[PDB]
Design a protein around this nucleic acid. Structure first.
Ligand SMILES: [Mg+2]
Ligand SMILES: [Mg+2]
Ligand SMILES: [Mg+2]
Ligand SMILES: [Mg+2]
Ligand SMILES: [Mg+2]
Ligand SMILES: [Mg+2]
Ligand SMILES: [Mg+2]
Ligand SMILES: [Mg+2]
Ligand SMILES: [Mg+2]
Ligand SMILES: [Mg+2]
Ligand SMILES: [Mg+2]
Ligand SMILES: [Mg+2]
Ligand SMILES: [Mg+2]
Ligand SMILES: [Mg+2]
Ligand SMILES: [Mg+2]
Ligand SMILES: [Mg+2]
Ligand SMILES: [Mg+2]
Ligand SMILES: [Mg+2]
Ligand SMILES: [Mg+2]
Ligand SMILES: [Mg+2]
Ligand SMILES: [Mg+2]
Ligand SMILES: [Mg+2]
Ligand SMILES: [Mg+2]
Ligand SMILES: [Mg+2]
Ligand SMILES: [Mg+2]
Ligand SMILES: [Mg+2]
Ligand SMILES: [Mg+2]
Ligand SMILES: [Mg+2]
Ligand SMILES: [Mg+2]
Ligand SMILES: [Mg+2]
Ligand SMILES: [Mg+2]
Ligand SMILES: [Mg+2]
Ligand SMILES: [Mg+2]
Ligand SMILES: [Mg+2]
Ligand SMILES: [Mg+2]
Ligand SMILES: [Mg+2]
Ligand SMILES: [Mg+2]
Ligand SMILES: [Mg+2]
Ligand SMILES: [Mg+2]
Ligand SMILES: [Mg+2]
Ligand SMILES: [Mg+2]
Ligand SMILES: [Mg+2]
Ligand SMILES: [Mg+2]
Ligand SMILES: [Mg+2]
Ligand SMILES: [Mg+2]
Ligand SMILES: [Mg+2]
Ligand SMILES: [Mg+2]
Ligand SMILES: [Mg+2]
Ligand SMILES: [Mg+2]
Ligand SMILES: [Mg+2]
Ligand SMILES: [Mg+2]
Ligand SMILES: [Mg+2]
Ligand SMILES: [Mg+2]
Ligand SMILES: [Mg+2]
Ligand SMILES: [Mg+2]
Ligand SMILES: [Mg+2]
Ligand SMILES: [Mg+2]
Ligand SMILES: [Mg+2]
Ligand SMILES: [Mg+2]
Ligand SMILES: [Mg+2]
Ligand SMILES: [Mg+2]
Ligand SMILES: [Mg+2]
Ligand SMILES: [Mg+2]
Ligand SMILES: [Mg+2]
Ligand SMILES: [Mg+2]
Ligand SMILES: [Mg+2]
Ligand SMILES: [Mg+2]
Ligand SMILES: [Mg+2]
Ligand SMILES: [Mg+2]
Ligand SMILES: [Mg+2]
Ligand SMILES: [Mg+2]
Ligand SMILES: [Mg+2]
Ligand SMILES: [Mg+2]
Lengths: 122, 134, 50, 86
RNA sequence: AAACUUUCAACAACGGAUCUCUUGGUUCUGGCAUCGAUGAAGAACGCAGCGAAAUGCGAUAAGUAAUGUGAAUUGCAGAAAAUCAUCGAAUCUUUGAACGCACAUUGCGCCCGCCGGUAUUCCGGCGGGCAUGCCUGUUCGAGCGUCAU
RNA sequence: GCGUGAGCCCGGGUCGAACGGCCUCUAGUGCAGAUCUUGGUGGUAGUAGCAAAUACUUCAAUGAGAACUUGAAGGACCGAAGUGGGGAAAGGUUCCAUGUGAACAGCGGUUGGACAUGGGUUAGUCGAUCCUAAGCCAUAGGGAAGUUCCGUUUCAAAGGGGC
RNA sequence: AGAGACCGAUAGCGCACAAGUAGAGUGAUCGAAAGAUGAAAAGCACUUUGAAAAGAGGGUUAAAUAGCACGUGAAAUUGUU
RNA sequence: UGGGCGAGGCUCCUUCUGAGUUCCCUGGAACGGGACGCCACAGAGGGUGAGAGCCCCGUAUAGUUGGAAGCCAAGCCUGUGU
RNA sequence: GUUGACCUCGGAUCAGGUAGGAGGACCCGCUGAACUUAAGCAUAUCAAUAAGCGGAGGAAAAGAAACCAACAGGGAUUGC
């Protein structure tokens, strides 16, 4: 046993990952308990176990969030964590269509008298 | 003489960048020339040095000593060459730090990555020569 | 006093943990300039403000 | 007064403030002499440039504000590099 | 005559001037506009195989994912990259405008749901919620303020 | 050695990486003073002094080294409003074991509240937590340009019991 | 991000360094000192005297009067001749 | 008077860049001195054991390898007057 | 007659939103000194400044004349 590569975690179902995580957690937890009372150079394997646990948690979270985004596709309201985080001011400013809306009075004269392409000969 | 506004000729800035460069930049900084034979073979002038390269020392008190690069201590901007060593008071043997620009690479450690590198350099050099010769 | 709040106890714990000399292997690193713990505090010398 | 009166100093005018961490929270007034807690605004005065710069932005971690320039430089984009595992 | 004091010189002390250096300041110029209830700035406490500090990070804790590069890191140990760059995916303890009520207490509550103890009522574990002002809408209402049958 | 002079040049020693002459240009450009600023160092000077709280002594062990370490013995003091045994505030690890070069303990030091390495604080019943006091802060409202001030039940549609 | 007829560790920002740090104050606030061995630690093995610190030999280095009280090393002040 | 393309150009990311480490002396170490060469749209700067254009990173020049597609745009295609 | 309209006024952890703090060099307002100068000092000056308070952005503010002018007339704002 030892390190868990992230490449071999993207194909497993959440359940498979959580199972691996469990083993890693136990192994890591035990590693500590065992180390304290014993000369185990594996007192370095704790770094590997902790990183593997972090990797499994990251993969589980990423899969769950991808599934949630798929579920909330084409829905009017989606949770705040799934909503894009640009900036407070960016999220508050007017939308493109609303900012580009013009009056019918402006639209008529824009249709019939726009800025022309012209040249003036010397 | 520099022209481009993005380039700076500040001695302070140059020294700061050199002495605080990250490891990936230090890799490029610690380049070494190829031997004449390898240069003719690959059409490549210089390459970043790598552990397992075979080099010959051409500067310093250890001139003409040859050996395999056993470590590339980027943190100290030096390399360690096999059997290019020194003795402490206790008689214990410690490697001597050699700057890669003071050595020439006589034999290269070659794997596809180290080679895609050589092919890129060769293609760029050949293209530049052709364009200048147009 | 024997009567302590949790916050005060926690801060005393942190001060006690910081009260130590520097590791020996620190001084052997390249570019090291730390000679000794300059922020050492003693209960008889410098009073910590809670 | 003086030495004899200094022996009666066993009380505390100020305790630790929850907002700024200094021992400047008046125990009876329940107001911080440094940060102005519990007022919503942080206490700050233009006649003390030193006091202003001791706690201006940049003297702490900037856990979130330090990542804003990179996100702006890349345009506050979302998604993943075309061709990424996951 | 010695000693002592003083003067002069050589050497040795004390001290850190002078010289040379400079990953630092200072000033000018050019480009850019991007904090926060989707929880900012700031504070606290923690996190490394061996760390007190600084730096980094948040119980996924000296960091995870992803992309690029392409063989290190290094004080020792260890192992089969990296204390690398980039960075669009995440994590992000207690706090703090700080938001259940408080807080000089790691204090005291209520609601929903799940799992146990004989349990709608009590106890325990877990998760999600409960601040204020205001806007739009919804629904339930008050008033002989008022309109017709 | 030169110059009236400010100064300039050279010999010898030390030392280790830059520097100078000439003509212009430029200035944060020339010190004995300012009870000048910072830093360093003298005579005084091995001097003033280390004299409140009755007081030490013998043998032995330890140790390079013992008046102020320890054991035993003797002689003494505090004399229950104690130099006793425990607490509140305050301190924060000073508590315990082991070890100890320097520094500190204004003499010494083998000793130490010092230094170093490791340990140590166990609650349904003791406290906090609960209650209210003097008092403080909200709320409804009313002031104030405003930071905010008054207000604490007041010109408020303000709740809890069962089937 | 680029520059300078700028300053060069008592200068230049208070801060070239674990600096708004250490420390002081109840508090508001106040607020330092402190850069340089060597190209490379090659940071002195070993012998001897000493309880030890250290000394004397010896070793490393171009150089140890460059030995972590480390580039150079002035004056005040001091010791020996 | 409405719609859609759009060569082509400007952007952006990315690969690549000339020439001595030749001989002699000093030195612990040439990056110093002397001799002989080379590059230069590059003799800015920095590092390397002492003043290095040619030892190394970079430096000049428009180019080029591969890619995303952000802009502008000659000109085309096509509705139609209630 | 009751319900039913509509008019005000409310409840709700009702559905969806929004504000607070930071920063404040520059910008828009409010509030607002005294030292100082006048060889004294009170108006004055410092100054419509410092300190205090509120509110924004990459700029802000101003801005398309109830303007300037008096001319043979100019022609929003801003800045040199
Ligand atoms: Mg009293
Ligand atoms: Mg509050
Ligand atoms: Mg801080
Ligand atoms: Mg005379
Ligand atoms: Mg000295
Ligand atoms: Mg100097
Ligand atoms: Mg947070
Ligand atoms: Mg809430
Ligand atoms: Mg809320
Ligand atoms: Mg209480
Ligand atoms: Mg209860
Ligand atoms: Mg049950
Ligand atoms: Mg429950
Ligand atoms: Mg809960
Ligand atoms: Mg409703
Ligand atoms: Mg009604
Ligand atoms: Mg030198
Ligand atoms: Mg002057
Ligand atoms: Mg003087
Ligand atoms: Mg004079
Ligand atoms: Mg003085
Ligand atoms: Mg004196
Ligand atoms: Mg005497
Ligand atoms: Mg006396
Ligand atoms: Mg006496
Ligand atoms: Mg006495
Ligand atoms: Mg004995
Ligand atoms: Mg005695
Ligand atoms: Mg008596
Ligand atoms: Mg008696
Ligand atoms: Mg009594
Ligand atoms: Mg006792
Ligand atoms: Mg007692
Ligand atoms: Mg008390
Ligand atoms: Mg004890
Ligand atoms: Mg002992
Ligand atoms: Mg003593
Ligand atoms: Mg002594
Ligand atoms: Mg002792
Ligand atoms: Mg002893
Ligand atoms: Mg201690
Ligand atoms: Mg009780
Ligand atoms: Mg309780
Ligand atoms: Mg109550
Ligand atoms: Mg009030
Ligand atoms: Mg009101
Ligand atoms: Mg300074
Ligand atoms: Mg100094
Ligand atoms: Mg200073
Ligand atoms: Mg203090
Ligand atoms: Mg020095
Ligand atoms: Mg020698
Ligand atoms: Mg010397
Ligand atoms: Mg020397
Ligand atoms: Mg010296
Ligand atoms: Mg002298
Ligand atoms: Mg090149
Ligand atoms: Mg030679
Ligand atoms: Mg050089
Ligand atoms: Mg030469
Ligand atoms: Mg060079
Ligand atoms: Mg709601
Ligand atoms: Mg709301
Ligand atoms: Mg605000
Ligand atoms: Mg006057
Ligand atoms: Mg006057
Ligand atoms: Mg007067
Ligand atoms: Mg005025
Ligand atoms: Mg003001
Ligand atoms: Mg503009
Ligand atoms: Mg505007
Ligand atoms: Mg008009
Ligand atoms: Mg005009």
């Amino acid at each position: 046993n030892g390190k868990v590569k992230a490449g071999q975690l993207w194909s497993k179902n959440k359940e498979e990952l959580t199972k691996i995580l469990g083993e890693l957690k136990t192994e890591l937890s035990q590693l500590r308990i065992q180390k304290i009372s014993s000369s185990g150079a594996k007192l370095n394997k704790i770094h590997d176990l902790r990183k593997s646990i972090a990797r499994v948690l990251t993969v589980i979270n990423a899969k769950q969030r991808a599934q949630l985004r798929l579920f909330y596709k084409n829905k009017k309201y989606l949770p705040l964590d799934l909503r894009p985080k640009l900036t407070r001011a960016l999220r508050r400013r007017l939308s493109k269509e609303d900012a580009s809306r013009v009056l019918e009075k402006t639209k008529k004269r824009l249709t019939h008298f726009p800025q022309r392409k012209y040249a003036v000969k010397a | 003489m520099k022209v481009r506004p993005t380039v700076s000729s500040s001695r302070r800035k140059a020294r700061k960048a050199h002495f605080s460069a990250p490891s990936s930049v230090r890799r490029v900084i610690m380049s070494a020339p190829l031997s004449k034979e390898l240069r003719e073979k690959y059409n490549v002038r210089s390459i970043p040095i790598r552990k397992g390269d075979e080099v010959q020392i051409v500067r310093g008190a250890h001139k003409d000593k040859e050996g395999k690069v056993t470590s590339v201590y980027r943190l100290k901007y030096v390399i360690h060459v096999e059997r290019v060593t020194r003795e402490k008071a206790t008689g214990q043997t410690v490697p001597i730090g050699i700057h890669p620009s003071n050595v020439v690479i006589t034999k290269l450690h070659l794997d596809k990555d180290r080679e895609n590198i050589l092919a890129r350099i060769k293609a760029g050099r050949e293209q530049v020569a052709k364009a200048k010769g147009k | 006093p024997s009567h302590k709040t949790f916050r005060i106890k926690q801060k005393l714990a942190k001060a006690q943990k910081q009260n130590r000399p520097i590791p020996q292997w620190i001084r052997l690193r390249t570019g090291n300039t730390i000679r000794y713990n300059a922020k050492r505090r003693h209960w008889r010398k410098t009073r910590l403000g809670l | 007064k003086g030495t004899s009166s200094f022996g009666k100093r066993h009380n505390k005018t100020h305790g630790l403030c929850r907002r700024c961490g200094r021992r400047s929270l008046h125990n009876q007034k329940k107001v911080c002499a440094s940060c102005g807690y519990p007022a919503a605004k942080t206490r700050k005065y233009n006649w003390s440039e030193k006091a202003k710069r001791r706690k201006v932005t940049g003297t702490g971690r900037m856990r979130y504000l330090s990542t804003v320039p990179r996100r702006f430089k890349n345009g506050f984009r979302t998604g993943v590099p075309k061709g990424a595992r996951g």
